[model samples]
Target chain A: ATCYCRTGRCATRESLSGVCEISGRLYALCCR
Target chain B: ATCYCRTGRCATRESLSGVCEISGRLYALCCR
Candidate 1:
């Protein structure tokens, strides 16, 4: 699963499975 | 404090102030 948000934005919501929020910046990754 | 670790590795230790460990990945952010 993939979803995009504002850049440099932290995770304000719970992350889904396989998807991790990038800190200090806006980005989510399925780091698996 | 800022520290960098392996990618895709979760935080194994307590994070310092303004610093948060990225879960499901290996990266530290000194988010303020």
Candidate 2:
């Protein structure tokens, strides 16, 4: 559901502030 | 994933929009 924007290669990273590597893989999370 | 910290502006592809665009701008998650 993440709409692509004009901020270079934007992807989901497994780090704070998404300052990590966003491989073309998959990721998940849990919320309350 | 990027916890939408004070970094500002986030947009992911049609993939893991979990932390992208705030998903309907919903604060389903959180940050500090």
Candidate 3:
């Protein structure tokens, strides 16, 4: 599955702080 | 515990992208 967030790569991003899918097709980055 | 991030208010921030605690005393902003 593809990751969606402000950085365009939040999902499965080990370096990323956190990732969350708020609503349908809506992913948000918890921390930056 | 206190929240630490780029926004200075991410721990309890309702509109934050996500929240994560990586390592001890280390916090980062994953996305927005």
Candidate 4:
């Protein structure tokens, strides 16, 4: 899915389904 | 502190801030 906030200005990709936030980097970058 | 919800070229600083959503990498927030 996508976290595209209404107008497509802000967005994030989802794996399963839910609100996507600026992540992957948050947990991903932290892990790496 | 700045979440920069406005259009003044978004940036991130620290605590008690609001509206900014870039990383703390001094430069380079993800592009849309």
C-alpha lDDT values of all predictions: 0.33, 0.29, 0.40, 0.24
Tens digit of per-residue lDDT, candidate 3, span B1-32: 12234436544443344444455443343332
Instruction: Give lDDT tens digits, candidate 3, residues A1-32.
Output: 12235436544443444445445444444332
Pairs clashing within candidate 3: A29-B17, A30-B17, A30-B18, A31-B29, A31-B30, A31-B31, A32-B29, A32-B30
Q: How well is candidate 2 docked (DockQ)?
A: 0.06
- Return the interface RMSD of the candidates, in order shown, one decimal each: 10.3, 8.3, 10.0, 11.3
Please give the C-alpha DockQ score of model 1. 0.05
Top candidate by DockQ: 3
lDDT digits (tens) for residues A1-32 of candidate 4: 01122212222342211122243222111100
Q: Tell me the TM-score of candidate 1's A chain.
A: 0.18
Give the Å shift of residue B17 in candidate 1. 9.6
- Classify candidate 3 by CAPRI docking class: acceptable
Where's the lowest-lDDT run of ten residues in candidate 2 chain B?
Answer: B13-22
Cα lDDT of model 4 by residue, B1-32, tens digit: 01213334533442221222334222222222
Find the candidate with the highest lDDT and give its number: 3
Off by over 4 Å in 3: A1-4, A10-15, A26-32, B1-13, B24-32
Best first by DockQ, ranked: 3, 2, 1, 4
Going through the candidates in order, their DockQ values are 0.05, 0.06, 0.24, 0.03
Q: Give the winner by TM-score.
A: 3
Task: In candidate 4, list every pair of residues with a backbone clash.
Answer: B3-B18, B3-B19, B3-B20, B4-B19, B4-B20
